[PDB]
Design an enzyme around this catalytic site. Sequence first.
Site, PDB file in Angstrom:
ATOM      1  N   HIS A  83       0.837  -1.219   0.000  1.00 31.71           N
ATOM      2  CA  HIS A  83       0.000   0.000   0.000  1.00 31.71           C
ATOM      3  C   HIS A  83       0.872   1.269   0.000  1.00 31.71           C
ATOM      4  CE1 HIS A  83      -3.118  -2.868   1.486  1.00 31.71           C
ATOM      5  NE2 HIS A  83      -3.837  -2.157   0.633  1.00 31.71           N
ATOM      6  N   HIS A  87       1.418   1.325  -5.727  1.00 29.40           N
ATOM      7  CA  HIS A  87       0.065   0.774  -5.777  1.00 29.40           C
ATOM      8  C   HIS A  87      -0.922   1.773  -6.342  1.00 29.40           C
ATOM      9  CE1 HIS A  87      -3.803  -0.867  -4.549  1.00 29.40           C
ATOM     10  NE2 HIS A  87      -3.928   0.041  -3.598  1.00 29.40           N
ATOM     11  N   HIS A 123      -6.246   7.559  -2.720  1.00 26.57           N
ATOM     12  CA  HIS A 123      -7.184   6.617  -2.098  1.00 26.57           C
ATOM     13  C   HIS A 123      -6.615   5.795  -0.942  1.00 26.57           C
ATOM     14  CE1 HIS A 123      -5.571   3.152  -4.389  1.00 26.57           C
ATOM     15  NE2 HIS A 123      -6.224   2.412  -3.505  1.00 26.57           N
TER      16      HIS A 123
HETATM   17 MG   LIG Z   1      -7.518   1.104   1.000  1.00 25.12          MG
HETATM   18 ZN   LIG Z   2      -5.779   0.515  -2.478  1.00 25.98          ZN
END
Ligand SMILES: [Mg+2]
Ligand SMILES: [Zn+2]
Length: 332
Positions: A83, A87, A123
């Site tokens: 993450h 990503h 995000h």
């Molecule tokens: Mg997430």
């Molecule tokens: Zn994600």
Amino acid sequence: TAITKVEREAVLVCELPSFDVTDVEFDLFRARESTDKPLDVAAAIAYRLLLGSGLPQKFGCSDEVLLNFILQCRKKYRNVPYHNFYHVVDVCQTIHTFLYRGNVYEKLTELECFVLLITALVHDLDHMGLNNSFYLKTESPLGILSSASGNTSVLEVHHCNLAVEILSDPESDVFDGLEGAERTLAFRSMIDCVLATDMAKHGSALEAFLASAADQSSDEAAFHRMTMEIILKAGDISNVTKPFDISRQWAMAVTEEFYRQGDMEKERGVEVLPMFDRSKNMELAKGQIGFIDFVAAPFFQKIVDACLQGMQWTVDRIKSNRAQWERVLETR
Ligand SMILES: [Mg+2]
Ligand SMILES: [Zn+2]
């Protein structure tokens, strides 16, 4: 903290030489390893996708404001296995291919496409490699905050907060050229998309999208919104729709995060699901096949059958990645 001219120029020099960033088979991993500045390459990929689309220019976002925005997002991603900034750049690129190779642009306005591409980059801001369950089960400060303030999507709320903070500065506000209802739609749709990435809401989000697609008198705004949520969701779990070797590398990376969470959970005396348990070593293939069968295959098959015909290749690729994992198992 302003962006230096040096930080910008480092991104701007990146050529991107043997790479087509618009293609469904674009290999982010090969892009990274072909430079000693993979974080600048990642930033340049986002910058070129966004500028190349024509969308920022339509909405009054200058080149400089875009690049500042991308670099302020980059500063808030951490050095975690999955993450991380790669990503979100991957999710941005993948959503681009869904919109423009899968022709999902047909279902959304240009403004909604710009918002989605931007939302991809915010995000997971400041993700620490730990999921929502970790925070709730350990009664960590963020877990307590969520519980006391209503919403169980601990991380997604956190990401939205940081996105809003980045966008409150005009030098990195990619929505500054919008006003009135368009500026409101940008923020509201960004936030809804990010909140919709919480996997606890997966079935609900999918049902709502399917119900809204079956209904010809759907509230157009709400159908458009649902479509945005589903496309961000699709990008977020799109690793299984990639060429197998790419798919496998993402799966290795996410698996390492799960193990590090499980270590942290063990040492805090909380329950560890076996998938998170390093010492109960598990097969990458069974996990991928499990995810495919119970989450990804029905998700992508349903959204394709319901309305997103042009994303058929995702179902085909899932089917062939699954078979490949099944052969990894059958030959062990
Ligand atoms: Mg997430
Ligand atoms: Zn994600």
